[PDB]
From TrEMBL, chain B:
<comment type="similarity">
    <text>Belongs to the acyl-CoA dehydrogenase family.</text>
</comment>
<dbReference type="InterPro" id="IPR006091">
    <property type="entry name" value="Acyl-CoA_Oxase/DH_mid-dom"/>
</dbReference>
<feature type="domain" description="Acyl-CoA oxidase/dehydrogenase middle">
    <location>
        <begin position="161"/>
        <end position="270"/>
    </location>
</feature>
<keyword id="KW-0274">FAD</keyword>
<dbReference type="Pfam" id="PF12806">
    <property type="entry name" value="Acyl-CoA_dh_C"/>
</dbReference>
<dbReference type="InterPro" id="IPR013786">
    <property type="entry name" value="AcylCoA_DH/ox_N"/>
</dbReference>
<feature type="binding site">
    <location>
        <position position="323"/>
    </location>
    <ligand>
        <name>FAD</name>
    </ligand>
</feature>
<dbReference type="Pfam" id="PF02770">
    <property type="entry name" value="Acyl-CoA_dh_M"/>
</dbReference>
<feature type="binding site">
    <location>
        <position position="198"/>
    </location>
    <ligand>
        <name>FAD</name>
    </ligand>
</feature>
<comment type="function">
    <text>Involved in the assimilation of dimethylsulphoniopropionate (DMSP), an important compound in the fixation of carbon in marine phytoplankton, by mediating the conversion of 3-(methylthio)propanoyl-CoA (MMPA-CoA) to 3-(methylthio)acryloyl-CoA (MTA-CoA).</text>
</comment>
<feature type="binding site">
    <location>
        <position position="171"/>
    </location>
    <ligand>
        <name>FAD</name>
    </ligand>
</feature>
<feature type="binding site">
    <location>
        <position position="320"/>
    </location>
    <ligand>
        <name>FAD</name>
    </ligand>
</feature>
<feature type="binding site">
    <location>
        <position position="164"/>
    </location>
    <ligand>
        <name>FAD</name>
    </ligand>
</feature>
<dbReference type="InterPro" id="IPR052166">
    <property type="entry name" value="Diverse_Acyl-CoA_DH"/>
</dbReference>
<feature type="binding site">
    <location>
        <position position="414"/>
    </location>
    <ligand>
        <name>FAD</name>
    </ligand>
</feature>
<keyword id="KW-0560">Oxidoreductase</keyword>
<feature type="domain" description="Acyl-CoA dehydrogenase/oxidase N-terminal">
    <location>
        <begin position="77"/>
        <end position="156"/>
    </location>
</feature>
Length: 594, 590
């Protein structure tokens, strides 16, 4: 089956970064980046990422799903060719592309590392997860670990010689980390002995790397109840001798791997810690704070994973829709040389194709806009600019997490539906992308919890002020619009006004009743998402209108823009009516009446 | 953990639709079914689906089918469970008593179909194909073929298949290439490959009776040259016993996302003996009544996966403790509150609940229309029911399966990370549900049929038959029902206005039909569900106090009206944008 191989969308990625956001203008100013990345460097990095992802990584995706991982007396093996692909990936510098050059990382800004993330996850989501975990663990160690821990573990982790894991989830504890049971017993020598059971640990055990550095959430015996008793620990699979060589295997193991709907090449481990030796990261009781930066970057990364599956689905769907012939166009036969017309002639096929296209390109734009905010928070020399950026990271990362993953699933489902019956057959690859995409809505925080964060902490919690940072920039953009941009800036203004009135309705309603927050959450986040994508599409329309006639690319972009505004943006109205119904109808029945 | 929703089924048929008062003026049914007969059959369907079918769903998925030198084997326990199912009369629950079928009307066979499909969709498909094939033969085959094949097929001893699809011919059956050579003995020799054939080969039965679309050497080109043939796996002697293996077999089976215990075969006919069903060149029409009953059938498959997911999700949401209710800890004795306390978990549960109970009611309503069309003594009542069946079966197929998928996704989401683990059963229900939106006509083709044939083709008369019944219902409503009837009237108004817009916009502009199709069918669906919910609300309002079941119904109705019905506004606005934005790019610009 399949037919369609992965090709990196480098043309669209150049349009978003270089033409829309003009990131290289910003690099010139910020002297932390000025001597790390320019247009030339960035282009060569993406050119190389496209080659390794399409050439080595993508051809492993299907066979990885069909084989899955194997557990053999506590050792986990990845599908054939995974250890070899990983070695190539790590030696190329790809594990630490966004890593700190102070410990041998490449130091690329998030707008570049995010585009690399998208390429690897589109080619093979299971594969992409492995280095994503290592990069995530480096952020937490860099931000909060002691100089001794950082000097001992970070260099091998940015080089991808040593892998990372995040050991948070327990049988009774995923969302509610405050009730974890894993214990850390302080030792006289300054270390801790970690005892407990962790579940659903991605890459908790595998055969890609000689060591895995686990970040383990635990409580000291004397810790407070709840999340304010949580501490974070660095726990190596293999303890490291004084000379930096591998020494004694730590008192921890993988008990089993899970049987899953998807990302079957991603080893998902029950990890048992039996007084495993570990070192505090950050401060006692401040384990959640130790992961604050990690989670901001991981929220965007998981959003990118959802987008990535949508993009892969679309490359297969447009190739299939031009090749597969069935029936005739309703205006009459289009392929008069053939027995039937390519299925792209049919209105409903174009509706599904254009929904995928508008969501993938809008999602790609929004992922870069949020990467730009992470880069401003980190690199801006101005305190007011960094603070505005940080507040925009707090507001938008939940939206990037929940919205890109929800739209990704919708996209992968459209991509499968375009194949008809063939779409249900595994050799065509479309059914795997639905199963792969589905995890991105559940882990690194369920989408329901992402939306409770948004409405609870970022909206109610800031009096609306964090939203208004975003919606004030969109109206400033609207006030700037020429006549031609008016086609997009006018419906955008109306969407922004809808969102502002819904925000005000919610701030009023949440005063009486705390149930109002959770009731509105997921649908409010969607209203916010379609509004944000209207902003991304308006921005992309401005550039394409200016460059119209210079290249066919700009015509395609404007057509996709016009689809988004005509057919997808009106989704805000029903979502706003549903939110405005309130929580009353959610609480008419007691638990027994369900 | 699967329990048949027999109380809800009793409510829909006996309390809302008052199905026994309809059976009173259906003479051909008073001899065959009444309320007690119905209840007792459902109680038996409940036991066999829960006891012997449900336990095989997970291991069936995990094992799937195997191909060994042309022989296809189903998973461990499938043959034994099929034999028990067949011996119980369940394959022929809806079939003609003239050949040993039980003769139960569609309202009752539809509820049996719900139980088997929610227990094990893979399992449910097998008997569904046989019953489908029985409808075609009964309607169109000669007395010789009916007398020879139907009795064993209704008893479940012989299975059926539909051998339609070819590599280049799926949605477009008109471009079929399988040949039928006429023989002097009055039989045909069939040659060609069929693909994606559910139960083309398996180990459940001694014989399989294939209904194969093929063309005679002198057939006219296109769909007007297509004939239907009965092609048995094993030829049958005079004494009715098994003769020689017929000249056909299975080349391979498909590797699928879901329904993995359902054998999907590449069938090779190499001069296989067959017999004409109905008339030469009328092969497609020989399946009109079959495809009407199977469209509702695939609708019910989607609904059934949604109902199984909800039974798991509601048990999990009461048992799993995580965090504390926004208004304060309730489980004072525990480390955390049951996740049913959280607004978002209640939203996902009530969405599943409202779609499942809404789909059950609409399904029963369409089944009631198939029964009225078939058994009504007066021509005008039969004629209107036939028109509502033609209008409503694509809505039942596409809307119950689309709502089914959404329902199974909510049910997985409620389990959190556990929802992605196969042992918990939620993720299988999403993969199994997905097929129902694709086969028996893609939902896109179901939408095209609705707007293209049933609306444009009738000048909106068919939909005015439906909407007239709804407005009569509204006009009759006392003030208590007004809570539901008022927003139902506004939804009916919205649909009519959208219909008028669509009839006008389609004139001279064929692209407008396809462009509006899927989103219009959803507007229709939510309007239809609003009608079903107002009907169930009137009966629950009248019976309030008599039992907690009615308080639960009214509460579910309130959620549907407050949070789901408003979905019509955005869908209406997308439809009204027209086909223009669909046709801005040429194919190369994608
Ligand atoms: C698991 C499985 C079981 C099956 N069982 C059987 C069986 O037992 N017997 C059997 O005969 N068949 C069977 N089929 C085949 C099936 O019923 C259909 O042929 C198939 O679902 C659709 O055909 P396709 O995959 O060739 O899609 P295509 O017809 O190629 O369609 C591809 C896409 O184009 C769209 N499209 C096509 N034509 C039009 C049009 N005119 N207007 C608008 N959109 C259009 C479709 O909606 C779809 O989105 C089965 C299929 C599967 C996957
Ligand atoms: C394939 C896979 C990979 C994973 N990888 C990792 C990993 O590497 N490391 C790791 O530590 N974890 C990992 N996880 C765990 C994952 O993050 C959790 O499963 C997820 O956060 C949900 O937690 P849970 O399964 O315990 O569900 P629960 O927290 O029990 O949630 C159940 C349901 O209740 C809802 N709910 C819970 N609390 C609230 C609340 N306060 N308000 C509203 N709704 C609420 C949830 O949204 C959900 O719908 C992985 C999971 C899987 C399946």
């Amino acid at each position: 089956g399949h037919m369609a191989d992965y090709k990196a969308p480098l043309r669209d990625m150049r349009f978003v970064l270089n033409e829309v956001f003009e990131v290289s203008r910003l690099w010139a100013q910020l002297p932390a980046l000025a001597e790390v990345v320019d247009a030339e460097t960035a282009a060569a990095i993406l050119e190389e990422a496209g080659k390794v992802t399409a050439g080595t990584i993508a051809p492993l995706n299907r066979p990885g799903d069909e084989e899955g991982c194997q557990w053999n007396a506590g050792a986990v093996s990845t599908p054939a060719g995974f250890p070899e692909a990983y070695r190539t990936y790590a030696e190329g510098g790809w594990v630490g592309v966004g890593g700190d050059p102070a410990y041998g990382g490449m130091g690329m800004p998030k707008v570049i590392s995010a585009q690399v993330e998208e390429l690897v996850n589109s080619a093979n989501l299971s594969f992409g997860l492995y280095p994503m975990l290592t990069a995530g663990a480096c952020l937490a160690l860099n931000a909060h670990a002691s100089d001794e821990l950082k000097d001992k573990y970070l260099p091998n982790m940015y080089a991808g010689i040593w892998a990372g894991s995040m050991c948070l989830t327990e049988p009774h504890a995923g969302t509610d980390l405050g009730i974890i049971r894993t214990r850390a017993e302080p030792q006289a020598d300054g270390s801790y002995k970690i005892s407990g059971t962790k579940i659903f640990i991605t890459g908790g055990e595998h055969d890609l790397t000689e060591n895995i550095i686990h970040l383990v959430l635990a409580k000291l015996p004397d810790a407070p109840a709840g999340p304010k008793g949580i501490s974070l620990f660095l726990v190596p699979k293999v303890l490291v001798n004084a000379d930096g060589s591998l020494g004694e295997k730590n008192s921890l193991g993988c008990g089993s791997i899970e049987h899953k709907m998807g990302i079957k090449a991603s080893a998902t481990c029950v990890m048992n810690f039996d007084g495993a030796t570990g070192w505090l990261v950050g401060e006692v009781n401040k384990g959640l704070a130790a992961m604050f930066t990690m989670m901001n970057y991981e929220r965007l990364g998981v959003g990118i994973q959802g987008l990535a599956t949508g993009e892969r689905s679309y490359q297969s769907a447009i190739e299939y829709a031009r090749e597969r012939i069935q029936s005739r166009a309703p205006t009459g036969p289009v392929a008069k040389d053939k027995a039937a017309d390519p299925i792209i002639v049919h209105p409903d096929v174009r509706r599904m194709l254009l929904t995928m296209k508008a969501l993938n390109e809008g999602g790609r734009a929004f992922s870069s806009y949020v990467a730009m905010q992470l880069d401003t928070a980190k690199y801006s020399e101005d305190a007011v600019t960094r603070k505005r950026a940080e507040e925009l990271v707090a507001l938008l990362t939940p939206v990037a997490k929940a919205f890109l993953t929800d739209m990704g699933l919708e996209t992968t489902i459209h991509g499968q539906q375009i194949f008809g019956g063939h779409g249900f057959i595994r050799e065509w690859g479309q059914e795997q992308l639905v199963r792969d995409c589905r995890i991105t809505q559940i882990y690194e925080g369920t989408n329901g919890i992402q939306a409770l964060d948004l409405v609870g902490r970022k909206v109610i919690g800031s009096g609306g002020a964090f939203s208004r940072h975003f919606t004030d920039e969109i109206k400033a953009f609207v006030a700037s619009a020429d006549e031609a941009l008016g086609e997009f800036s006018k419906p955008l203004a109306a969407a922004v006004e809808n969102l502002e009135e819904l925000t005000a309705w919610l701030l009023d309603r949440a005063k009486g009743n705390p149930n109002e927050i959770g009731a509105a959450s997921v649908e409010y986040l969607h209203v916010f998402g379609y509004t944000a994508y209207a902003y991304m599409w308006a921005l992309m329309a401005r550039t394409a209108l200016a460059k119209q006639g210079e290249d066919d690319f700009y015509a395609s972009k404007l057509g996709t823009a016009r689809f988004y505004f005509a057919r997808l943006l009106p989704r805000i109205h029903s979502l706003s009516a549903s939110v405005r119904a309130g929580s009353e109808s959610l609480y008419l029945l007691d638990a027994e009446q369900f």
